[PDB]
Amino acid sequence: RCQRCLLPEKLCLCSTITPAQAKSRFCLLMFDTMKPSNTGRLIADILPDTVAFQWSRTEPSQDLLDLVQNPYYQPMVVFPASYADEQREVIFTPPGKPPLFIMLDGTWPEARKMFRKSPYLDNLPVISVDLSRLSAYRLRQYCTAEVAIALLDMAGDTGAAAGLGEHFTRFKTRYLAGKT
Amino acid sequence: RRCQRCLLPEKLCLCSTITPAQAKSRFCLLMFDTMKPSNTGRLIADILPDTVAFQWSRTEPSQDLLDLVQNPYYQPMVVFPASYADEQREVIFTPPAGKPPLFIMLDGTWPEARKMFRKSPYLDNLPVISVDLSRLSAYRLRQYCTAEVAIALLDMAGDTGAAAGLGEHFTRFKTRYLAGKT
Numbered sequence: 001r002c003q004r005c006l007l008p009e010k011l012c013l014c015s016t017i018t019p020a021q022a023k024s025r026f027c028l029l030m031f032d033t034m035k036p037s038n039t040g041r042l043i044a045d046i047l048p049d050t051v052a053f054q055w056s057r058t059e060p061s062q063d064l065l066d067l068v069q070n071p072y073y074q075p076m077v078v079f080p081a082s083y084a085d086e087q088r089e090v091i092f093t094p095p096g097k098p099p100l101f102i103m104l105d106g107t108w109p110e111a112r113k114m115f116r117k118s119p120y121l122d123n124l125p126v127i128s129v130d131l132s133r134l135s136a137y138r139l140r141q142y143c144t145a146e147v148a149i150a151l152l153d154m155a156g157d158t159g160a161a162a163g164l165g166e167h168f169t170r171f172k173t174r175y176l177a178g179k180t
Numbered sequence: 181r182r183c184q185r186c187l188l189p190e191k192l193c194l195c196s197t198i199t200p201a202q203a204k205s206r207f208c209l210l211m212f213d214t215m216k217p218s219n220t221g222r223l224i225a226d227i228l229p230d231t232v233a234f235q236w237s238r239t240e241p242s243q244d245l246l247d248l249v250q251n252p253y254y255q256p257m258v259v260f261p262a263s264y265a266d267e268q269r270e271v272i273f274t275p276p277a278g279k280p281p282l283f284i285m286l287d288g289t290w291p292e293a294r295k296m297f298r299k300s301p302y303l304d305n306l307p308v309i310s311v312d313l314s315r316l317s318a319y320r321l322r323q324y325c326t327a328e329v330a331i332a333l334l335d336m337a338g339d340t341g342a343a344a345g346l347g348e349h350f351t352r353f354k355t356r357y358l359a360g361k362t
């Protein structure tokens with residue numbers, strides 16, 4: 001197995017990676033800090049400015065707090081609108097200020113716990129994802145990578161959205177064939 | 181649900197990725213019947229579109245096939261393991277210089293290629309070329325199928341650009357063929 005791409009050495013895709021540029025930026029809030037089937041790591045392959053943090057219940061990192069409170073960005077929590085309280089601001093599109101998409105990586109019981117017990121995210125708006133936009137990139141819950149492609153298209157980053165789609169498709173195919 | 185041109189599930193269609201190459205060598209596929217997706221001889225035509233294919237016949241060979249294996253513009257070779265040749269049969273381990281090579285492939289199952297090798301009087305005066313398969317290492321590829329053999333022959337003839345192009349195309353097909361199988 002390759003160590004960079006985690007695919008068996010006969011199926012390495014590291015030679016095919018070509019990054020794209022986007023006005024949007026991603027922040028990965030990880031619960032365990034990686035398994036080969038985790039799709040959030042594919043985002044950094046196409047957008048190397050992606051930042052990642054290990055989630056902590058008691059003591060959040062000072063690097064993380066300085067980012068979500070940086071007025072340069074318009075931060076927003078990416079989580080389905082059904083899970084939000086009646087007073088929580090919910091939006092359906094990313095507004096001038098470049099978005100900072102905060103993803104909650106992990107299984108659904110863990111992403112719910114991260115959503116419910118992080119006081120530093122409670123004043124941020126929630127963005128509900130229009131997954132219908134995956135049709136324009138010929139893609140069919142939905143993993144962290146598929147949601148990211150929809151967000152890039154929602155913000156006008158078509159070049160980066162198309163790139164992540166071909167890279168994600170390239171990975172899924174070599175992953176299935178590696179099981180054979 | 182399956183693409184008609186590449187014979188893979190439409191979600192794994194690779195037709196948009198095909199880029200042809202150019203080579204001094206030419207291929208002639210002698211086939212036993214008409215297609216199963218795991219048959220690899222068609223990948224050669226994707227990268228070298230001047231490939232010609234004929235249906236084998238025990239009684240009446242075609243005149244397009246007979247005129248081509250007697251056209252003195254080419255140097256024709258029967259691609260077959262030398263172990264099955266008569267002791268008087270000329271055997272070679274490299275394509276000669278000058279005249280461009282014309283590789284005659286016997287595509288089918290090993291009982292079918294053996295029958296064609298013995299019952300074709302129009303092929304018996306031609307030399308048998310023995311393929312050097314260790315050349316597949318230069319293309320990161322590990323008997324073998326028809327397409328794998330053709331990559332070696334291209335390398336023996338000095339057509340490295342086309343040998344590499346067919347290398348990617350073969351790996352692409354095999355990867356997407358295994359994935360859609362699961």
Ligand SMILES: CSC[C@H]1O[C@@H](n2cnc3c(N)ncnc32)[C@H](O)[C@@H]1O
Nearest residue numbers: 078079080103104106111129144147
């Ligand atoms: C493996 S959990 C997938 C993650 O992607 C994001 N996500 C997935 N589906 C949705 C959705 N329908 N709406 C908003 N965010 C989502 C959330 O960050 C979630 O924790």
Ligand SMILES: CSC[C@H]1O[C@@H](n2cnc3c(N)ncnc32)[C@H](O)[C@@H]1O
Nearest residue numbers: 259260261286289290293325326329
């Ligand atoms: C019978 S299907 C195998 C295909 O690979 C070719 N092939 C496999 N091994 C050899 C070999 N050792 N010498 C020549 N052709 C071979 C065959 O001629 C046919 O095209």
Ligand SMILES: [Zn+2]
Nearest residue numbers: 002005012014
């Ligand atoms: Zn790799």
Ligand SMILES: [Zn+2]
Nearest residue numbers: 183186193195
């Ligand atoms: Zn196709």
